[PDB]
């Protein structure tokens, strides 16, 4: 047991993921509102591993503070709209993927 | 409201848990049979765990016993961990948001 370490790592990754997911939605808007800003964001995203949430944001500060603040807000909105539905959706999907994989391989043995 | 973002996040979470499972199993192996740990190491270089179904399928051509072990461990990990995350990530984001905000606003001064 002790699934606690795995939980800490998972929650971190999720935090970074949702950040990514916000940056994504924002870049979708910019591509339509302020295309230069949009491309700036892409070029920034290439210089910085977005999956380092905090490093990514601390770096962003030093270059475009309005955007950083926007992400922090958009991510948290996403966080609230999405989080409760996750344990159901994943566990259900895992069971299903587990199903198909077992059938697939347990049948592959007869081939 | 953000169903398409829920979909993509769950899919990631699925693969992430698959990843985390391969990581426990990889630790056990490294003790039990070094030979397989090395193998599993480079298997993961040739196949991206992030696309997990494709990963598991490719593994079937090589180590079906393990594919099966992964499926069991990943579901266990799921059980232990999933229900805790929405309190965790939320309260984490909030904290983080706070610290970034403070830190940004204090730079505007200093």
């Amino acid at each position: 047991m002790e699934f606690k370490k795995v939980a800490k790592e998972t929650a971190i990754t999720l935090q970074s993921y949702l950040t990514y997911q916000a940056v994504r939605l924002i870049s979708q808007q910019l591509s339509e509102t302020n295309p230069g800003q949009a491309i700036w964001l892409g070029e920034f995203s290439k210089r910085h591993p977005i999956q380092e949430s905090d490093l990514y944001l601390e770096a962003m500060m030093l270059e475009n503070k309005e955007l950083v603040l926007r992400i922090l807000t958009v991510r948290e909105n996403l966080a609230e709209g999405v989080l409760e539905f996750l344990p159901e959706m994943v566990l259900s999907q895992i069971k299903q993927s587990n199903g198909n994989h077992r059938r697939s391989l347990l049948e592959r043995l007869t081939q | 409201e953000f169903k398409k973002v829920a979909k993509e996040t769950a899919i990631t979470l699925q693969s992430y848990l698959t990843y985390q499972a391969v990581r426990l199993i990889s630790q056990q192996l490294s003790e039990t049979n070094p030979g397989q740990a090395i193998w599993l190491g480079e298997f993961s270089k040739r196949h991206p765990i992030q696309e997990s179904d494709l990963y598991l399928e490719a593994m079937m051509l090589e180590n079906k016993e393990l594919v099966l072990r992964i499926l069991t461990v990943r579901e266990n990990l799921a059980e232990g961990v999933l229900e805790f995350l929405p309190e965790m990530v939320l309260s984490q984001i909030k904290q983080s948001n706070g610290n970034h905000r403070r830190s940004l606003l204090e730079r505007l001064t200093q």
């Binding site: 993921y17 990514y20 995203s45 999956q51 | 990631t12 992430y16 990843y19 765990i49």
Partner: peptide, 7 residues
């Protein structure tokens, strides 16, 4: 595309 990857 901005990509997300788990290190």
């Amino acid at each position: 595309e901005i990509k997300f990857e788990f290190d």
